[PDB]
Amino acid sequence: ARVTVQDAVEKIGNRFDLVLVAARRARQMQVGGKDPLVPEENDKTTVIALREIEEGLINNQILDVRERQEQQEQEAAEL
Amino acid sequence: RDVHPTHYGRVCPIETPEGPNIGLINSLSVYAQTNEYGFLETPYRKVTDG
Amino acid sequence: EEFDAIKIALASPDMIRSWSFGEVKKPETINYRTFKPERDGLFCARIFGPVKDYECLCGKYKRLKHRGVICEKCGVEVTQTKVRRERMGHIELASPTAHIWFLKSPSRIGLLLDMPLRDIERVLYFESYVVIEGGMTNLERQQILTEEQYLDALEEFGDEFDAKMGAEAIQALLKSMDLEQECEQLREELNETNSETKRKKLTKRIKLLEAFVQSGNKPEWMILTVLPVLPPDLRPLVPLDGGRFATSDLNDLYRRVINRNNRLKRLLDLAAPDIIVRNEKRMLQEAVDALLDNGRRGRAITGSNKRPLKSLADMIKGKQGRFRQNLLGKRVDYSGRSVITVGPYLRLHQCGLPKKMALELFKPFIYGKLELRGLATTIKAAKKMVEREEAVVWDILDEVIREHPVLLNRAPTLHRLGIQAFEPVLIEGKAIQLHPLVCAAYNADFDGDQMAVHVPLTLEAQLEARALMMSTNNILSPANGEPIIVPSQDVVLGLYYMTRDCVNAKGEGMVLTGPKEAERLYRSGLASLHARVKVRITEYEKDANGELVAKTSLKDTTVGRAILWMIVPKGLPYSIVNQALGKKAISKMLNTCYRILGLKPTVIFADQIMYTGFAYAARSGASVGIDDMVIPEKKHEIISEAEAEVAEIQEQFQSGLVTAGERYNKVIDIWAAANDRVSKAMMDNLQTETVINRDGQEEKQVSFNSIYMMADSGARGSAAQIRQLAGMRGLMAKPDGSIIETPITANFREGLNVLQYFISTHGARKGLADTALKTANSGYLTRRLVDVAQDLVVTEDDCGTHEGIMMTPVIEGGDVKEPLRDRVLGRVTAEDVLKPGTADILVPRNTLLHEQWCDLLEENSVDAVKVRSVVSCDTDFGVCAHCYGRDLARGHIINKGEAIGVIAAQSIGEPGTQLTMSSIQVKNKGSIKLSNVKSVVNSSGKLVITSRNTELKLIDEFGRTKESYKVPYGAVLAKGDGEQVAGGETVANWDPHTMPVITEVSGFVRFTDMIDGQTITRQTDELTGLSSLVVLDSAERTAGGKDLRPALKIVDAQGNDVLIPGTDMPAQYFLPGKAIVQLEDGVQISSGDTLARIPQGLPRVADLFEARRPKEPAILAEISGIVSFGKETKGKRRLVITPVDGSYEEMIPKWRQLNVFEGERVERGDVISDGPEHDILRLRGVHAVTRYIVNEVQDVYRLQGVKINDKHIEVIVRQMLRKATIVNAGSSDFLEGEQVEYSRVKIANRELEANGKVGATYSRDLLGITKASLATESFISAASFQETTRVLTEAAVAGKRDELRGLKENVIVGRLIPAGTGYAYHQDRMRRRAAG
Ligand SMILES: [Mg+2]
Ligand SMILES: [Zn+2]
Ligand SMILES: [Zn+2]
């Protein structure tokens, strides 16, 4: 959280992907403004994204499975 | 930039700057004046026969 | 927008007109009153652009009445402005003139023609003519003709020869010539006579000729005919605020072309006489080069400043230009400076900040939040609501601030940890607050050293300031395995007072129940910080698997030692806090804390070691004065007892006995021999002089001095710094630096003399004039160390290739020096390695070597193991994590994506600033090893050797060596190798002056091959009588026997030569000078007795990396075999070697002493001269090349107290070896050296099964590392920093291109760096090339 993002690296496996997979996560909530999964606890968007990470909730695949159902469910709406 | 035994009496060993001009600037000690030529003199007392 | 690569070539004069917009024909810039751009001028609107919005000059086409219409009266359009930077102008010359990058420097144009620059300089200066083309074959091309011999070439023939004297005369020589006739005729005779110094010009031109062929460059463009003019936002003409103007320099320089070109085309119209038109075209190239290189060709050119001008290239040359100062480093918004100050209440991830600084800095972030609040309505409204002091201004400020971390910076940056990223806390001040514990990370203290501040505005870098650079992510420095939160001054002192073992405190002996209740007793005045009290505790261990197992025990401990147990998170023994807790124990007590419990407890822990360290100092109080420093009474007599002796050898010096050196070396000793004992004067008088009485008579314990508790703490110094206070302060010296005869008898407690203060400046002003230029020499050395490492980023997990270097200790010289396990620690094993009970292989060809697997190797007595280095890794364009082991900074398995080199280039160049300031005896008992030995049993019984490679090494019985020392060729011993040697027994002995020529064979002597007057003298011993034929030195004797090698033949009674045991080689000593053979004729000498005796830094680091050979290289043995000697001193001695089956004779400076004799056998890997020792790369392997260098410069740091992991230097040795000279051909060129990786490419496509053998074999090469950055495939990586004129000539003659692959390339162009967070990007860019 405020002090530590080490447990956030024993989840993914990479210090640099954490800079990417949280930024891809928080950009759906910075200006995309979606619902967060953890409660807020009066924190900015970068802190709820890392608190999301520790319980195994936002991965590289979970950032893409969440969109790929959402892509075709949007692409079953245009026609 | 460094001292030498003729410095004593004429030029102080403690009022220099520190950085890239440490050995270029000096300051003359309180008792000295100069010559008609411009070489520094510095007083002493003589001892005639003890 | 986006572009893949770039390209550079010579620009044609057709390309220039297609680049441009209009021909600048008049020097007028602005009129004298109407400040206006000028028609057909330099700032012209008809060429370069518009200025005001949709507004022409005279007022015909305005206000979008006529969209695409030029005001044809004045020549000016209406269109969109700000093209005054993009839109270049041009100019067409009348006489063509020459580029100065392509002429002055090889010349690269006269180098093309093999024509001298002095042959050019009669032509392009208008001194004498030259031929263009002899029509008749009587003359030949490239022939300078003087103007008087030109008329003879006129009046002979007239029409059958063509010759000018002009720049056109060189221009005609480029249009005329062909290359396919030349470059296949240079092909024709490269095979005729390939002698090198003629063939190296056949190497360079078949480059240079065929450079132009396949690329598309032409050398016609190499002499200018058209010029491009800089768009006037690069050459402005600006006013000041006071109506005064100030221009760029190039408006002046461009002016000198357009006038002097004008008074040629007008002077052509009037047909000036043929003397003057020459000087007309002289001045153009005088003033064209004034643009390119002001002070290059002749005398410098200055103006009204009376100082030289900044040229066109001087905007790219040096650090005054744009590569070194305005592209890599920059200016920056969103930043500021202030002064530092401490905080004893910030936690580690926090830091202070002013309000007035942040509210002024975070002004773009407030104006977004106020509209989301709506108290401010618009933007200009919200700016108004800053000055009006709203409570919501400081309720949005903190709400902007919270979880937005912030960089801080300090100069000089010396390594990675100079920049960090804390979290803000506000305070009501105007000075940047800072944690105290980060002062080890900066080598800084609080004397007003300012610090920068920076904000990561984007989302992504804000995460980098939290995931990468947040100050609790990185505690462990990349130099070693000890952290950088070694507690600095008072936290190491507040402990050392508190943990102590005296008997003074009341309450000692009764038992307590828990470390809570000591609060109830010590504060009440029934307890003392140090009182030795039995206490029952409850510690915790992890003897299960990650699970706490309880135990509870009692400890006869002290009270202050017990209160530390209130914090420590139940994993450490009570024995770890059972000491005095100096700086030695505390830093390991963090190291052992995260050795066991992981990282995150040791960031909470160091927080609560700082809060106590001031708090029990605030109980204690540390006070100093004059009374604390005590002089013992043994000061009067100890100097007086030598003061009677300083007149003693002076009185010898009045008797005329002692020389200068023997008296100077004795007056320096006895004046300082007692100074050695003034440490013994203050030890027993000031360590246990205390007398506190406690249930006995007295007590001998620790001191109550409050000084020796400060140095065993670790705050400032140790027991050598008190010697300048309590005793006398050593000796003194001159800034020349010779050691003084009379040292000091006074100090800082009694009072020095007016002369003792005079000469004290000498050691101090020099001592600051030394280091004030020793910070320059490291900011040099760092800057090129980061340039060889600018390509190094990991690629793959494994190469899986052959094994590499071998891990052994460095224990030579004295005792243990480096533990093998620590050099083992952090790595991956290379070879399948076992335990000393056979075949217990602990690796599956690779194991990560952390500290518990290091404990296994310390357990077994085995001490040799192989570990992959960067040399045995062979992934292209990177290294592998299976050959790096542990990233020392993060402290676990190195991932994929990280940098390698620049962390080591920050590691190695950091403590360069902190750096610059007989008989061999056995030590203990054990085993004996001395191998690679051929020796003899002497006339005394013991091992006497007659070989070079032998030396003594002392081992224990287990196998792990204690000592080793060099023994000379021919050393007399007292025990045998492979025996038992007791401790303290004299093994070896030899005279230092002589190197023995001791007889290994045993035969009679005979005075052969020397007759007195030819190669020798007769020097009989007038005292003894015993003297043989006395050989003389190299210059005194007669030349009539100087071609005859003088040999005392070993003969027997029949007349033979007594052979060596084993060989049929004759045994006679070809004895060189000064070697007086003792015994006369007919005497049998033994085996093993002398026939003749032969009696007699940081720029040091800048040899070891800058790839320099010494001035006195010690030659090795080229090829082995039975060697003879050679020629007699035609400059130097030659060496006739004849191998056992193989195939050289070369110079020898014979005025030094040789090693191997005229007929002795030598093996490769042996010096043939004496001295210090590229050759070891030429004839030996690869690993031993890296061995001597790593074991020399890491050795330097141990001498002056630094520790650096040897991998960092090994990282450079891989970047020190990139190239490979080639022997054969068939696929490519023949002998030019090339990239070793690419030399491993063409074996894998052509020497592999496409063809049986068509390739070319190759060794390893070695550049200087200051030019290995200049000798590169990328060129802007080489043009950014050094010699920018040269590297942009040769890049353009060949038609190079770049791939933007180095990380200095992606940073200048605004791209993302190919490392770290951006490496996971750049491979998608890399995979999109191969797929589309
Ligand atoms: Mg300071
Ligand atoms: Zn107009
Ligand atoms: Zn490898």
Side-chain angles (χ1 to χ4, degrees):
Chain A
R2 224 175 187 162
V3 192
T4 307
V5 279
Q6 186 273 295
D7 207 284
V9 160
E10 212 63 46
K11 179 60 68 177
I12 287 96
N14 204 338
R15 273 274 214 272
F16 309 96
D17 297 338
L18 192 88
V19 191
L20 299 164
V21 306
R24 296 217 305 262
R25 181 51 188 145
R27 278 265 155 80
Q28 310 150 310
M29 210 164 293
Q30 174 74 51
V31 78
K34 304 310 288 311
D35 172 63
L37 297 170
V38 186
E40 177 198 357
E41 288 204 287
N42 196 353
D43 273 342
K44 273 202 177 41
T45 66
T46 49
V47 186
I48 43 160
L50 286 154
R51 289 279 86 172
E52 264 176 332
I53 277 160
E54 187 154 343
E55 312 200 347
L57 267 285
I58 307 290
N59 213 49
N60 196 1
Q61 287 91 356
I62 308 169
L63 263 175
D64 287 337
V65 168
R66 197 160 180 176
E67 65 93 35
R68 207 173 301 279
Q69 55 90 26
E70 205 270 340
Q71 206 50 246
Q72 301 157 16
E73 190 72 28
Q74 183 157 88
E75 284 151 337
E78 181 42 58
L79 75 169
Chain B
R1 293 174 159 279
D2 283 320
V3 288
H4 175 252
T6 66
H7 283 57
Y8 170 70
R10 293 146 193 89
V11 158
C12 196
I14 211 70
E15 291 179 356
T16 75
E18 50 272 8
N21 292 267
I22 168 157
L24 303 159
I25 321 290
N26 290 265
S27 72
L28 42 79
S29 278
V30 295
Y31 296 144
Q33 71 271 5
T34 178
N35 218 305
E36 76 162 35
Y37 309 123
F39 305 95
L40 312 164
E41 52 195 57
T42 289
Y44 291 98
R45 262 196 83 201
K46 198 192 189 179
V47 195
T48 42
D49 303 297
Chain C
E1 191 267 318
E2 183 195 43
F3 53 92
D4 183 35
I6 56 164
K7 185 187 173 298
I8 271 174
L10 270 302
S12 171
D14 173 62
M15 194 77 60
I16 309 294
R17 303 185 230 87
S18 58
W19 264 348
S20 196
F21 295 95
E23 174 146 1
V24 198
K25 299 179 193 69
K26 276 171 144 181
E28 296 199 10
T29 88
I30 49 153
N31 213 356
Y32 79 103
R33 168 177 325 184
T34 71
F35 295 147
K36 197 180 186 205
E38 176 79 10
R39 171 204 279 144
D40 265 325
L42 263 292
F43 308 149
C44 187
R46 322 169 68 188
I47 300 176
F48 291 91
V51 178
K52 280 184 186 59
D53 265 336
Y54 278 126
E55 186 265 338
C56 65
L57 311 181
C58 302
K60 186 54 208 161
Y61 306 113
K62 303 274 189 71
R63 65 196 65 241
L64 265 173
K65 195 194 192 199
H66 302 267
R67 175 84 171 184
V69 169
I70 278 180
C71 182
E72 304 178 358
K73 163 194 196 147
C74 72
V76 182
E77 65 266 4
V78 194
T79 59
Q80 203 163 351
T81 73
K82 192 245 149 202
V83 294
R84 294 294 289 263
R85 166 175 274 132
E86 199 265 351
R87 274 223 195 189
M88 307 162 57
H90 80 298
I91 172 60
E92 291 214 54
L93 271 175
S95 90
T97 48
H99 212 302
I100 209 52
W101 291 22
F102 290 118
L103 192 57
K104 264 321 281 262
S105 177
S107 279
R108 284 283 199 297
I109 188 153
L111 185 72
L112 166 80
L113 314 170
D114 206 76
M115 175 191 297
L117 174 47
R118 320 297 199 89
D119 190 278
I120 299 168
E121 279 156 320
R122 309 289 172 272
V123 175
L124 279 196
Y125 283 82
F126 294 158
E127 178 156 14
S128 301
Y129 274 63
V130 78
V131 69
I132 295 189
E133 191 267 346
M136 266 291 296
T137 67
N138 195 8
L139 303 179
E140 74 283 345
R141 215 181 288 271
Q142 298 196 19
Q143 185 184 12
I144 272 182
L145 316 170
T146 44
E147 302 158 318
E148 52 272 11
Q149 199 271 331
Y150 185 73
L151 296 187
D152 308 324
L154 170 67
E155 294 139 22
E156 278 157 58
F157 316 123
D159 60 348
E160 286 163 353
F161 84 117
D162 294 323
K164 298 316 162 306
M165 184 201 69
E168 309 166 6
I170 300 190
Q171 272 296 94
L173 261 292
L174 314 166
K175 304 183 248 305
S176 46
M177 69 192 317
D178 208 321
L179 309 180
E180 308 274 338
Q181 273 79 8
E182 313 204 319
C183 57
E184 278 190 16
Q185 268 164 355
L186 300 185
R187 258 156 172 78
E188 183 181 355
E189 49 88 21
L190 192 148
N191 61 71
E192 280 284 316
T193 163
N194 47 71
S195 180
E196 188 179 40
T197 42
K198 278 79 54 179
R199 189 250 192 280
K200 64 183 191 72
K201 285 98 165 175
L202 309 174
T203 300
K204 286 190 311 269
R205 299 185 71 176
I206 305 184
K207 286 177 176 58
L208 263 177
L209 300 185
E210 214 164 0
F212 279 101
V213 184
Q214 289 178 11
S215 60
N217 309 324
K218 296 170 74 185
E220 283 81 359
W221 312 321
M222 283 269 299
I223 307 288
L224 274 308
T225 62
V226 191
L227 273 77
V229 194
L230 264 176
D233 210 43
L234 264 299
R235 42 171 185 92
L237 195 151
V238 196
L240 299 199
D241 213 347
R244 206 161 72 248
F245 298 104
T247 71
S248 157
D249 211 7
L250 303 181
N251 308 266
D252 191 5
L253 275 177
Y254 269 114
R255 172 165 68 256
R256 219 187 285 177
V257 165
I258 320 287
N259 324 312
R260 293 174 184 203
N261 167 52
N262 264 132
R263 55 200 287 191
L264 157 63
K265 312 185 300 301
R266 179 95 297 164
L267 208 73
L268 194 151
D269 186 87
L270 306 188
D274 49 291
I275 177 68
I276 281 188
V277 192
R278 304 282 184 252
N279 191 81
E280 178 40 55
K281 320 192 305 172
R282 271 198 179 93
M283 301 171 55
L284 312 182
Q285 82 177 341
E286 189 268 327
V288 169
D289 295 356
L291 321 180
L292 290 139
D293 273 327
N294 191 23
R296 209 189 253 274
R297 182 160 176 186
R299 208 157 295 261
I301 295 93
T302 175
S304 170
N305 51 358
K306 256 71 70 187
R307 278 156 305 237
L309 308 160
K310 199 185 186 42
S311 81
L312 258 163
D314 269 322
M315 298 283 183
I316 310 101
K317 187 185 278 291
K319 63 169 70 179
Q320 311 88 244
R322 305 281 81 80
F323 264 129
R324 211 167 306 152
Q325 272 299 99
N326 275 117
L327 272 175
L328 282 170
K330 268 189 210 177
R331 290 275 148 187
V332 67
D333 261 336
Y334 300 95
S335 296
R337 292 171 80 90
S338 157
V339 184
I340 45 181
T341 168
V342 312
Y345 54 93
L346 303 173
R347 257 173 74 244
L348 191 79
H349 72 100
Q350 297 155 342
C351 85
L353 216 49
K355 289 199 314 292
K356 303 171 297 312
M357 198 166 173
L359 164 66
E360 225 279 338
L361 254 173
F362 275 78
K363 184 172 288 294
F365 276 81
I366 305 163
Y367 297 156
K369 298 300 187 181
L370 289 163
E371 307 155 346
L372 194 74
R373 293 306 178 125
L375 306 156
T377 57
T378 66
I379 313 166
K380 264 155 61 204
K383 173 165 76 67
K384 288 280 176 50
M385 300 318 292
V386 166
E387 284 157 342
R388 308 270 67 76
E389 195 36 75
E390 294 289 326
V392 303
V393 161
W394 326 88
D395 284 325
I396 282 186
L397 207 85
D398 171 272
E399 203 76 351
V400 161
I401 276 161
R402 170 167 91 263
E403 321 304 311
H404 209 109
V406 55
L407 294 166
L408 326 174
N409 167 42
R410 192 213 193 269
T413 287
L414 302 177
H415 53 284
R416 191 185 71 181
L417 291 175
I419 40 170
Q420 264 198 345
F422 302 91
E423 178 174 306
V425 195
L426 274 182
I427 34 166
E428 42 184 26
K430 212 187 293 201
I432 290 179
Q433 194 175 6
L434 188 43
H435 213 266
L437 280 166
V438 305
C439 274
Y442 302 134
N443 287 349
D445 60 331
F446 297 90
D447 66 337
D449 283 333
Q450 287 149 63
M451 280 202 62
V453 77
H454 292 275
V455 169
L457 314 164
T458 178
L459 259 179
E460 288 80 9
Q462 184 174 349
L463 303 146
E464 296 160 0
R466 167 164 304 265
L468 305 173
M469 265 167 301
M470 180 93 77
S471 314
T472 76
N473 299 138
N474 318 281
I475 293 96
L476 189 53
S477 174
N480 46 24
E482 50 91 24
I484 208 156
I485 322 296
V486 44
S488 166
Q489 295 298 100
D490 301 338
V491 280
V492 79
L493 160 70
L495 300 189
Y496 192 87
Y497 175 81
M498 160 162 49
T499 171
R500 225 193 177 206
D501 210 12
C502 63
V503 71
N504 67 50
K506 73 194 95 167
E508 165 159 2
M510 49 90 65
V511 64
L512 311 183
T513 69
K516 293 189 296 300
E517 84 168 2
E519 301 297 321
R520 202 182 76 188
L521 298 172
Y522 156 68
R523 168 88 279 153
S524 90
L526 295 160
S528 157
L529 218 33
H530 35 84
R532 179 192 311 120
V533 159
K534 284 174 148 289
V535 160
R536 183 164 202 277
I537 58 191
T538 310
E539 47 200 271
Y540 293 100
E541 272 80 4
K542 42 167 56 177
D543 210 347
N545 307 99
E547 187 85 28
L548 217 55
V549 291
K551 54 168 308 299
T552 173
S553 201
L554 299 97
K555 279 267 194 290
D556 40 345
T557 178
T558 76
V559 173
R561 282 170 201 163
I563 319 183
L564 266 299
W565 199 260
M566 283 279 114
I567 322 163
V568 184
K570 310 307 193 129
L572 284 77
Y574 198 73
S575 58
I576 201 165
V577 298
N578 203 359
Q579 36 197 317
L581 274 300
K583 197 142 97 171
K584 266 72 61 184
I586 283 156
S587 183
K588 100 200 174 185
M589 182 256 289
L590 316 164
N591 204 335
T592 63
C593 165
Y594 92 103
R595 191 196 256 125
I596 301 172
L597 283 81
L599 176 75
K600 205 260 205 194
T602 320
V603 72
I604 310 181
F605 191 49
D607 280 334
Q608 305 301 138
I609 305 302
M610 178 187 47
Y611 296 140
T612 86
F614 312 142
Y616 295 136
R619 300 284 323 274
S620 182
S623 181
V624 292
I626 188 157
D627 277 21
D628 293 317
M629 310 293 165
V630 199
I631 322 294
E633 305 93 345
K634 270 68 55 186
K635 179 54 162 38
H636 168 50
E637 296 86 19
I638 183 167
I639 302 180
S640 197
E641 277 157 323
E643 192 188 29
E645 326 174 326
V646 304
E648 276 271 8
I649 66 170
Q650 182 148 28
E651 271 188 353
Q652 303 169 0
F653 208 47
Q654 296 328 292
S655 281
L657 201 147
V658 60
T659 176
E662 205 189 17
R663 188 218 186 268
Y664 167 69
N665 291 142
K666 202 168 270 299
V667 74
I668 189 191
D669 281 11
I670 62 169
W671 269 121
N675 170 77
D676 277 320
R677 308 155 51 209
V678 82
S679 49
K680 311 294 102 178
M682 66 170 276
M683 190 65 56
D684 52 27
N685 287 116
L686 310 172
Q687 189 67 218
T688 64
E689 213 58 43
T690 77
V691 276
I692 304 181
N693 41 1
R694 176 71 154 83
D695 57 269
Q697 177 194 9
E698 291 107 11
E699 194 47 71
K700 305 303 146 185
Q701 60 173 20
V702 303
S703 314
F704 269 39
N705 203 4
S706 162
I707 313 153
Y708 209 73
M709 72 186 51
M710 316 200 289
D712 281 336
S713 84
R716 296 300 298 182
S718 275
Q721 295 199 13
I722 316 295
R723 198 183 278 150
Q724 297 184 317
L725 274 71
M728 75 214 68
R729 46 175 295 179
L731 265 68
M732 286 285 136
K734 195 188 170 187
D736 175 299
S738 92
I739 319 172
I740 208 62
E741 302 90 353
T742 43
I744 323 290
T745 84
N747 66 331
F748 297 139
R749 212 210 188 275
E750 304 165 355
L752 313 155
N753 206 48
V754 315
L755 180 72
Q756 288 152 35
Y757 194 72
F758 182 45
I759 327 168
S760 183
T761 293
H762 294 49
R765 189 196 299 200
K766 150 175 187 173
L768 188 41
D770 217 24
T771 182
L773 193 132
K774 283 294 286 189
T775 60
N777 291 316
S778 184
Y780 205 98
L781 191 98
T782 319
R783 203 186 168 272
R784 297 155 326 170
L785 273 164
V786 307
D787 218 333
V788 290
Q790 68 104 29
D791 303 284
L792 211 54
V793 50
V794 276
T795 301
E796 210 184 9
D797 307 299
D798 208 345
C799 69
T801 63
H802 205 87
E803 273 54 41
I805 67 167
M806 186 167 243
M807 290 313 171
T808 81
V810 72
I811 48 186
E812 71 258 4
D815 282 345
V816 61
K817 300 308 144 205
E818 161 81 22
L820 169 139
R821 65 186 288 267
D822 302 344
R823 274 195 43 200
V824 155
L825 177 74
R827 313 297 281 277
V828 154
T829 51
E831 78 169 7
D832 312 88
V833 61
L834 43 84
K835 308 181 177 76
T838 312
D840 297 319
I841 312 166
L842 67 95
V843 311
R845 212 211 161 188
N846 46 304
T847 48
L848 171 63
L849 306 175
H850 47 101
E851 185 66 26
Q852 300 89 357
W853 290 74
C854 273
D855 291 323
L856 307 169
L857 213 51
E858 195 194 326
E859 190 270 334
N860 279 118
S861 45
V862 75
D863 214 32
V865 57
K866 273 205 169 173
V867 157
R868 281 162 81 102
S869 168
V870 285
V871 181
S872 64
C873 188
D874 279 289
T875 42
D876 208 306
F877 289 139
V879 317
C880 90
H882 283 78
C883 287
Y884 203 87
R886 276 165 66 128
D887 176 27
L888 276 81
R890 181 178 169 268
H892 277 274
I893 311 176
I894 166 164
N895 293 140
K896 166 192 53 186
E898 285 92 350
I900 295 100
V902 197
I903 318 180
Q906 288 283 11
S907 312
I908 294 168
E910 192 269 338
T913 311
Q914 287 84 236
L915 199 148
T916 201
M917 65 302 284
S918 88
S919 176
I920 288 144
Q921 192 73 6
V922 294
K923 302 299 121 177
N924 286 121
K925 271 196 69 68
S927 303
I928 303 304
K929 209 171 315 302
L930 287 91
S931 319
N932 212 327
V933 168
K934 173 170 63 65
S935 41
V936 76
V937 172
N938 50 357
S939 157
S940 198
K942 307 305 185 173
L943 266 292
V944 155
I945 327 164
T946 321
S947 183
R948 187 46 94 183
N949 305 114
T950 171
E951 49 88 19
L952 160 68
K953 314 160 292 303
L954 197 48
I955 319 102
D956 60 5
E957 57 90 9
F958 300 90
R960 33 189 57 194
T961 279
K962 291 178 290 190
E963 302 279 331
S964 41
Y965 306 88
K966 180 193 177 70
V967 315
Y969 154 72
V972 160
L973 292 182
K975 285 300 190 193
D977 177 61
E979 286 196 317
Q980 190 64 246
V981 173
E985 200 206 28
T986 171
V987 190
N989 191 294
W990 75 102
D991 169 70
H993 308 253
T994 194
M995 165 180 160
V997 198
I998 43 171
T999 172
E1000 206 209 344
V1001 292
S1002 310
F1004 281 17
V1005 73
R1006 193 194 145 206
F1007 297 170
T1008 82
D1009 292 322
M1010 291 162 265
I1011 297 93
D1012 301 69
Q1014 285 142 89
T1015 313
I1016 54 163
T1017 177
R1018 180 56 188 210
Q1019 277 184 48
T1020 171
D1021 288 14
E1022 301 154 354
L1023 186 139
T1024 298
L1026 298 169
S1027 196
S1028 195
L1029 302 194
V1030 170
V1031 61
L1032 301 180
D1033 274 321
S1034 292
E1036 181 164 338
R1037 78 179 76 84
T1038 322
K1042 210 160 304 204
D1043 213 342
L1044 198 153
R1045 314 297 205 185
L1048 275 183
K1049 183 177 286 188
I1050 296 301
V1051 201
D1052 268 333
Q1054 295 65 41
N1056 319 271
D1057 192 331
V1058 195
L1059 305 166
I1060 297 97
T1063 69
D1064 286 8
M1065 198 77 198
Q1068 45 209 59
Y1069 286 166
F1070 290 96
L1071 290 168
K1074 219 187 187 176
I1076 299 181
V1077 186
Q1078 174 71 237
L1079 51 95
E1080 294 219 334
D1081 210 333
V1083 161
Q1084 186 190 357
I1085 188 56
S1086 71
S1087 202
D1089 189 281
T1090 39
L1091 269 178
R1093 288 145 205 197
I1094 313 182
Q1096 187 68 264
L1098 180 147
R1100 266 132 181 88
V1101 175
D1103 307 280
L1104 294 183
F1105 290 94
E1106 295 304 316
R1108 183 90 200 286
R1109 302 174 188 88
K1111 70 160 139 304
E1112 212 200 336
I1115 179 129
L1116 285 182
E1118 293 273 322
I1119 314 99
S1120 318
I1122 292 301
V1123 61
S1124 303
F1125 281 170
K1127 218 177 196 297
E1128 320 297 331
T1129 321
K1130 186 77 176 134
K1132 275 164 293 298
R1133 171 212 305 285
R1134 291 163 174 173
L1135 190 79
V1136 184
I1137 171 67
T1138 69
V1140 286
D1141 200 69
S1143 163
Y1144 172 70
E1145 64 205 6
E1146 219 186 11
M1147 46 203 65
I1148 287 184
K1150 52 189 293 187
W1151 305 270
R1152 274 81 186 182
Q1153 200 172 344
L1154 287 79
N1155 209 336
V1156 184
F1157 290 92
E1158 201 268 346
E1160 290 296 328
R1161 201 171 75 103
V1162 79
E1163 202 43 52
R1164 50 181 281 142
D1166 193 7
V1167 285
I1168 46 170
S1169 158
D1170 267 12
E1173 65 183 45
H1174 305 74
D1175 198 1
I1176 213 84
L1177 191 81
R1178 164 158 70 82
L1179 286 173
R1180 315 277 100 78
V1182 182
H1183 310 261
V1185 176
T1186 81
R1187 191 172 38 83
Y1188 161 73
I1189 182 60
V1190 164
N1191 304 150
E1192 197 76 16
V1193 56
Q1194 175 266 3
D1195 160 80
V1196 172
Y1197 301 125
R1198 164 180 45 131
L1199 156 75
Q1200 310 251 12
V1202 200
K1203 255 82 177 198
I1204 284 175
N1205 202 313
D1206 82 326
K1207 168 179 50 60
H1208 297 251
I1209 307 173
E1210 286 163 354
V1211 162
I1212 309 299
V1213 196
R1214 188 182 165 166
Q1215 285 297 146
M1216 280 181 78
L1217 313 170
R1218 284 171 89 266
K1219 306 223 169 299
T1221 34
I1222 47 168
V1223 181
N1224 306 320
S1227 46
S1228 90
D1229 204 344
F1230 187 80
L1231 69 101
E1232 199 258 326
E1234 188 67 2
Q1235 330 285 124
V1236 59
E1237 320 91 1
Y1238 186 64
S1239 190
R1240 269 85 185 273
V1241 163
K1242 68 180 70 173
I1243 56 169
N1245 303 280
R1246 294 184 194 93
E1247 286 194 2
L1248 258 58
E1249 290 302 317
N1251 190 280
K1253 177 167 172 40
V1254 73
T1257 197
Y1258 54 108
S1259 91
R1260 302 295 287 270
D1261 292 343
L1262 195 151
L1263 278 296
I1265 75 159
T1266 199
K1267 83 185 60 49
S1269 51
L1270 294 183
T1272 330
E1273 306 274 298
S1274 65
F1275 74 103
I1276 312 167
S1277 276
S1280 72
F1281 70 104
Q1282 270 215 12
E1283 205 176 350
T1284 184
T1285 326
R1286 297 281 187 268
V1287 292
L1288 274 196
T1289 44
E1290 201 266 349
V1293 300
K1296 299 184 157 77
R1297 74 177 268 267
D1298 215 21
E1299 287 181 350
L1300 299 170
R1301 190 173 296 279
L1303 92 171
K1304 310 288 159 60
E1305 302 301 304
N1306 280 282
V1307 60
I1308 48 155
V1309 304
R1311 255 148 200 77
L1312 288 161
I1313 317 298
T1317 73
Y1319 174 80
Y1321 169 87
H1322 191 81
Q1323 58 164 41
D1324 308 349
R1325 174 177 295 210
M1326 180 264 303
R1327 80 169 176 249
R1328 196 172 294 111
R1329 302 143 195 257

